[PDB]
């Protein structure tokens, strides 16, 4: 496998959101996924509704809306409902609505998803260099996390019980200090132009590697 991955480089991962006061992560994580997707399987690169998911992907899924959900039944709204449409077809609005979902301005689709073995930082390794982005929860709940600036993040307080979904759009390190590549979704001020580098095999810091999973368009 490469040393290094960032989807960046490859065109495969749009701006990073802002998601308000809305508990959206998850559609988010699950959108961003299945954007890198899009792009590997078009060479197109649309960012995709993350609203359509709060307002659709919903009672069924297990999901609610700017309360929370789940990647992985996002990913089964997605294929349930033969398309996705783009984020500039049905905006962002950081609030539960009526489905809104338009045919009409289907910008992806999704035929499944994988889900990665619990706790395999490797095999998600492996994904990600092979696969593309992968959408994982971590425990972002300290103040360390949302005080992100720079750097490799490790939080000795983390426990592997997640409760925030964010992309690995990449690994790394710095200066011999492993990383996850993570995007996150609350705007580019959070760390570096909304990114956190997550410390990376040590024993799966905060989660990032207990609930992987990715999408095929
Ligand atoms: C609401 C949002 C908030 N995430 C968050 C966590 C810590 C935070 O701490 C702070 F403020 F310090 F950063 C801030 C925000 N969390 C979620 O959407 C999380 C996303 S999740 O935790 O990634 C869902 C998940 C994925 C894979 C395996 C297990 C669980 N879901 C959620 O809370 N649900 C699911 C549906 O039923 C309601 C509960
Ligand atoms: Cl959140
Ligand atoms: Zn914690
Ligand atoms: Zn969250
Ligand atoms: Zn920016």
Not at 176 to 185: H, P, R
């Amino acid at each position: 496998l490469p040393d290094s991955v960032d989807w960046r480089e490859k065109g495969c991962v749009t701006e990073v959101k802002y998601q308000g006061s809305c508990g959206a992560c998850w559609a988010f994580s699950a959108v961003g996924a299945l954007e890198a997707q899009l792009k590997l399987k078009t060479g197109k690169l649309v960012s995709l509704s993350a609203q359509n998911l709060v307002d659709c992907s919903t009672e069924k899924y297990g999901n609610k809306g700017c309360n929370g959900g789940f990647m992985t039944t996002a990913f089964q709204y997605i294929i349930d409902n033969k398309g996705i449409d783009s984020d500039a077809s049905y905006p962002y609005k950081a609030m539960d609505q009526k489905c809104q979902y338009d045919s009409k301005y289907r910008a992806a689709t999704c035929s499944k998803y994988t889900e990665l073995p619990y706790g395999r930082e490797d095999v998600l390794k492996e994904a990600v260099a092979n696969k593309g982005p992968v959408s994982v929860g971590v425990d972002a709940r300290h103040p360390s996390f949302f005080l992100y600036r720079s750097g490799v993040y490790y939080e000795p307080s983390c426990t592997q019980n997640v409760n925030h979904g964010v992309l690995v759009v990449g690994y790394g390190d710095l200066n011999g200090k492993e990383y996850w590549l993570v995007k996150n979704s609350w705007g580019h001020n959070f760390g570096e132009e909304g990114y956190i580098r997550m410390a990376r095999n040590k024993g799966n810091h905060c989660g990032i590697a207990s609930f992987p999973s990715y999408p095929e368009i």
